């Protein structure tokens, strides 16, 4: 699940989505 | 002084293509990220993507598939919206906007451009 | 996608009366966010988390609210904030605006 901010695209949080 | 300065206003005709500039300046332009936003009498203010001047990475709104690209420039400290295919659906005012994922705890649009008329006909 | 509805449509003010406007979600939201924007120019950062106030705003307004309702509320209402108030979420991607609050004063 991509975030808004491209910058938090990375993998913050996205990876565990 | 931290100016996000857009193009004024474009005629573009029934099914064409516009590219659209969006301009930085008073800040690092890739440790922040850009976004660009849609405006209708109808259907208000609508988000269409962004992109992080770091790398040039994106993130794009279902509702503009295959009609919004945002490319980004060499260091002229700019963004691009490229619409395609257009019909009157989308004679608009477009802004841009950038993000600080940070003022005091939430992801914010700090500072935005003018917002660039388009009125398609031919 | 969060759908975002705001109330009133439109909210008739007298000058230095206290009023408020409402933005309602769809789903639970972490924060909420208010631009003011005058005809013919671009939406300007008004409240960024429901508290807080972006630069140069006065501090007749005040915001509040949790999970899916808010307020932002002026105190008292003056001339220069004849404007539409939109809402903003940025929890759900993608990010959504309300339909606005067009504030009109009832001078």
């Known amino acids: 699940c991509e975030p808004a901010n491209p910058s938090e695209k990375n993998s913050p949080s996205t990876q565990y989505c | 002084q931290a100016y996000l300065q857009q193009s004024g206003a474009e005629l573009v005709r029934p099914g064409a293509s516009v590219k659209m500039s969006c301009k930085a300046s008073?800040?690092?332009?890739?440790?922040?990220?850009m976004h660009w936003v849609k405006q209708t009498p109808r259907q208000g203010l609508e988000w269409i993507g962004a992109?992080?001047?770091?790398?040039?990475?994106?993130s794009y709104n279902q509702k503009f598939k295959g009609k919004a690209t945002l490319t980004v420039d060499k260091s002229s400290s700019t963004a691009y919206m490229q619409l395609s295919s257009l019909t009157s659906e989308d004679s608009a005012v477009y802004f841009c906007?950038?993000?600080?994922?940070?003022?005091?705890?939430?992801?914010?649009?700090?500072?935005w451009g003018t917002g660039t008329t388009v009125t398609v006909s031919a | 996608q969060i759908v975002l509805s705001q109330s009133p449509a439109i909210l008739s003010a007298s000058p230095g009366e206290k009023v408020t406007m409402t933005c309602r979600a769809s789903?639970?939201?972490?924060?909420m966010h208010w631009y003011q924007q005058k005809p013919g120019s671009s939406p300007k950062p008004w409240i960024y988390?429901?508290?807080n106030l972006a630069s140069g705003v006065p501090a007749r307004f005040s915001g509040s609210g949790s999970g899916t309702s808010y307020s932002l509320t002026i105190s008292r209402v003056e001339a220069e904030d004849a404007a539409t108030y939109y809402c903003?979420?940025?929890?759900?991607?993608?990010?959504?605006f309300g339909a606005g609050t067009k504030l009109e004063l009832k001078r």
């Open positions: 903003q979420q940025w929890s759900f991607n993608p990010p959504t």
């Open positions: 992109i992080y001047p770091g790398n040039g990475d994106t």
């Open positions: 906007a950038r993000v600080v994922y940070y003022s005091n705890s939430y992801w914010y649009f700090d500072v």
């Open positions: 008073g800040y690092t332009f890739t440790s922040y990220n």
């Open positions: 988390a429901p508290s």
């Open positions: 789903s639970s939201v972490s924060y």
